[PDB]
Design a protein around this ligand. Structure first.
Ligand code: IHP
Length: 263
């Protein structure tokens, strides 16, 4: 409570760096305790986002993202249960140049976190965390749910990619901490998107005709998103990310010729 609220404050001070590991680890432990009240924890994070300073607000966003990734699932479950999440579409800190330049990224980052919650609410699992492979969810899913789901991923991916940062804009510790988390989410989200396309192609011939048509439209949009992903990983390459962590895209885009199995 007070110990929770104080830690939220420490995670979100005016200092120009991401939240410290020590405050983050305590918060993650908080999400794991059955007696902690999640809503009060969340509310303290939303309050920090009404501050006028870009640094405070960005750190609060980052703390929230880190909890959605490393915290107990009950945290993102609560976030998804609300009606309103972040409302920072018009944020602008004019106190200094860094302010003006960071404001745009705050807007875009907060929209991605909203979409991450909405996606959880729509499908009841986190795309980033579920079993991959051949024995996992994305892959062993009936044709109905599939046609339903893939479009939600696409939408979450689009919001992720609208962050649209260049190498030369990654110039302070706050925006870099955000980007590292965005990188992690992007790679897991891609894996899940790809697993679904694989399911589709597998099933795209044995299926009804109007289905086939929804299908086609997804494969379609996947191929342009492929291009955007690759531009995003190239930013990561330019910044210096270990090339071993960057995934190989050389995989599944040559078959656009079922645009004729609508024979
Ligand atoms: O007493 P600790 O739990 O070992 O942490 C204290 C201090 O806490 P206090 O403000 O109560 O003195 C700060 O911890 P946080 O407020 O960040 O939780 C931090 O000091 P700074 O804010 O100056 O970085 C630093 O711990 P650390 O070395 O892990 O950053 C250390 O302060 P001192 O070593 O100067 O006593």
């Amino acid at each position: 409570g007070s110990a929770v609220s104080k830690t939220v404050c420490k995670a979100t001070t005016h200092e120009i760096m991401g939240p410290k590991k020590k405050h983050l680890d305590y918060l993650i432990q908080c999400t794991n305790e059955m007696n902690v009240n999640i809503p009060q924890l969340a509310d303290s994070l939303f309050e920090r986002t009404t501050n006028s300073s870009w640094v405070v607000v960005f750190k609060s966003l980052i703390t929230t993202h880190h909890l959605m990734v490393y915290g107990n699932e009950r945290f993102i479950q609560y976030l998804a249960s609300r009606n309103t999440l972040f409302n920072l579409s018009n944020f602008l800190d004019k106190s200094g140049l860094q302010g003006y330049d960071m404001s745009t990224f705050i807007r875009r980052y907060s929209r991605y976190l909203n979409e991450k919650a909405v996606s959880y609410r729509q499908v009841a699992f986190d795309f980033t965390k579920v079993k991959r492979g051949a024995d996992g969810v994305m892959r062993t899913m009936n044709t109905e749910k599939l046609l339903k789901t893939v479009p939600i991923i696409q939408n979450q991916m689009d919001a992720l990619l609208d962050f649209n940062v260049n190498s030369n804009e990654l110039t302070n510790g706050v925006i870099n901490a955000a980007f590292m988390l965005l990188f992690k989410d992007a790679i897991r989200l891609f894996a899940a998107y790809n697993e679904g396309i694989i399911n589709l192609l597998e099933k795209y011939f044995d299926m009804k005709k109007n289905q086939c048509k929804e299908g086609l439209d997804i494969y379609k949009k996947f191929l342009t998103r492929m291009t955007r992903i690759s531009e995003f990983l190239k930013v990561a390459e330019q910044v210096g990310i270990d090339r071993g962590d960057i995934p190989d895209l050389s995989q599944a885009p040559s078959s656009l010729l079922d645009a004729l199995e609508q024979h």
